[PDB]
Design an enzyme around this catalytic site. Structure first.
Site, short mmCIF file in Angstrom:
data_model
loop_
_atom_site.label_atom_id
_atom_site.label_comp_id
_atom_site.label_asym_id
_atom_site.label_seq_id
_atom_site.Cartn_x
_atom_site.Cartn_y
_atom_site.Cartn_z
N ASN A 1 -2.57 3.09 13.67
CA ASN A 1 -3.09 4.55 13.21
C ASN A 1 -4.13 4.02 12.44
O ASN A 1 -4.07 3.21 11.39
CB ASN A 1 -1.94 5.29 12.73
CG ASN A 1 -2.81 6.53 12.17
OD1 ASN A 1 -2.69 7.52 12.83
ND2 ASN A 1 -3.23 6.59 10.88
N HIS B 1 0.87 -1.25 -0.13
CA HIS B 1 0.09 -0.03 -0.04
C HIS B 1 0.73 1.14 0.06
O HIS B 1 2.20 1.32 -0.18
CB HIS B 1 -1.09 0.04 1.23
CG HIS B 1 -0.52 0.10 2.39
ND1 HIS B 1 -0.04 -1.05 3.13
CD2 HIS B 1 -0.36 1.13 3.34
CE1 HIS B 1 0.50 -0.74 4.39
NE2 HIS B 1 0.22 0.52 4.65
N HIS C 1 -6.88 -1.67 6.71
CA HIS C 1 -5.90 -0.62 7.07
C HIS C 1 -5.98 0.46 6.51
O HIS C 1 -5.54 1.53 7.09
CB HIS C 1 -4.72 -1.21 7.30
CG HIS C 1 -3.47 -0.54 7.60
ND1 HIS C 1 -3.25 0.02 8.79
CD2 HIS C 1 -2.42 -0.06 6.55
CE1 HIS C 1 -1.99 0.72 8.30
NE2 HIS C 1 -1.46 0.79 7.25
N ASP D 1 5.76 3.74 4.82
CA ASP D 1 6.51 2.51 5.35
C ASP D 1 6.75 1.57 4.47
O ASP D 1 7.78 0.83 4.17
CB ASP D 1 5.42 1.90 6.52
CG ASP D 1 6.18 0.34 6.84
OD1 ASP D 1 7.19 0.68 7.17
OD2 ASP D 1 5.43 -0.54 7.15
N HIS E 1 1.33 3.96 2.13
CA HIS E 1 2.04 4.57 3.28
C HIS E 1 3.61 4.47 3.20
O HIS E 1 4.04 3.67 2.36
CB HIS E 1 1.70 3.99 4.57
CG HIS E 1 0.31 4.45 5.16
ND1 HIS E 1 -0.54 3.63 6.05
CD2 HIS E 1 -0.36 5.32 4.98
CE1 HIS E 1 -1.43 4.20 6.19
NE2 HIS E 1 -1.44 5.22 5.62
O1 LIG Z 1 0.53 -0.56 10.37
C1 LIG Z 1 0.42 0.16 11.30
O2 LIG Z 1 -0.55 0.05 12.08
C2 LIG Z 1 1.12 1.38 11.55
C3 LIG Z 1 2.06 1.29 12.87
S1 LIG Z 1 3.69 1.08 12.36
C4 LIG Z 1 3.56 1.94 10.59
C5 LIG Z 1 4.09 3.34 10.71
S2 LIG Z 1 2.40 3.80 10.92
C6 LIG Z 1 1.67 2.98 9.61
C7 LIG Z 1 2.10 3.13 8.32
S3 LIG Z 1 1.98 1.20 7.62
N1 LIG Z 1 1.88 1.61 10.36
ZN LIG Z 2 0.11 1.33 6.53
ZN LIG Z 3 2.00 -0.61 8.84
#
Ligand SMILES: O=C(O)[C@H]1CS[C@@H]2CS[C@@H](CS)N12
Ligand SMILES: [Zn+2]
Ligand SMILES: [Zn+2]
Ligand SMILES: [K+]
Length: 222
Positions: A175, A81, A144, A85, A83
């Site tokens: 989040n 996805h 998510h 990350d 984000h």
């Molecule tokens: O997947 C998640 O819940 C969170 C916690 S750690 C990482 C950085 S915020 C989000 C982006 S995938 N992700």
């Molecule tokens: Zn994410």
């Molecule tokens: Zn994540």
């Protein structure tokens, strides 16, 4: 057992089977160290990653580690996805001629968030093969994030859950600003329905589990 770390200790890879490892990187979130997982697939046409990492520095280091170790090039990455990350190393990929697969929606979202665009080539169900390695990508619906996909390795019954799927240690949903908590349960059910016998499930963050991680996710949604 087999776990290899980098110099600074920020990156780790641990074998699941002859051709499949988990990569994990410690990145920097709010405001501590936070680990992120993906897969490294050792195939006979090259290395394929399911997700790269937090930023360009870690993605470059990851690539360098697995290239050195397995003595072949990273050819392809599957971005699960948009984000930071997951998409954060996109510039590294594009500039090295690494193919960055994603859905169209993930591509659209990357660009909306100011990243360089992955290929947008994945449909709801996409079947890829690299060397002898079979890889299915599946969009189960929103959860998510709006765009989140899972990755299935049919030869091993191994499911990369990505951030759709929480590890045992996760005691809340994380989040949820970009999340869809009503549809997330259905999405997870869509995964349970499509993949009825699962050997291992890799969560976006935390330790590898099994089908129970999907059931855990459902509970956390109640
Ligand atoms: O997947 C998640 O819940 C969170 C916690 S750690 C990482 C950085 S915020 C989000 C982006 S995938 N992700
Ligand atoms: Zn994410
Ligand atoms: Zn994540
Ligand atoms: K086969």
């Amino acid at each position: 057992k087999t776990v290899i770390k980098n110099e600074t200790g920020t990156i780790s890879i641990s074998q699941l089977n002859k051709n499949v490892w988990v990569h994990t990187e410690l990145g920097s979130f709010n405001g501590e160290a936070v680990p992120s997982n993906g897969l490294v697939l050792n195939t006979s046409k090259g290395l394929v990653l399911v997700d790269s990492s937090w930023d360009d520095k870690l993605t470059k280091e990851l690539i360098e580690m697995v290239e050195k170790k397995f003595q072949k090039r990273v050819t392809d990455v599957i971005i699960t996805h948009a984000h930071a990350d997951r998409i954060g190393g996109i510039k590294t990929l594009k500039e090295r001629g690494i193919k960055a697969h994603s859905t169209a929606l993930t591509a659209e979202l990357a660009k909306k968030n100011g990243y360089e665009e992955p290929l947008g080539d994945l449909q709801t169900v996409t079947n890829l093969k690299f060397g002898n390695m079979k890889v299915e990508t599946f969009y189960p619906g929103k959860g998510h994030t709006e765009d989140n996909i899972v990755v299935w390795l049919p030869q091993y019954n191994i499911l990369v859950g990505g951030c759709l799927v929480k590890s045992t240690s996760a005691k809340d949903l994380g989040n949820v600003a970009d999340a869809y908590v009503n549809e997330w349960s259905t999405s997870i059910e869509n995964v349970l329905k499509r993949y009825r016998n699962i050997n291992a499930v890799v969560p976006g963050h935390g330790e590898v589990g099994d089908k129970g991680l999907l059931l855990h996710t459902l509970d956390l949604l109640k």
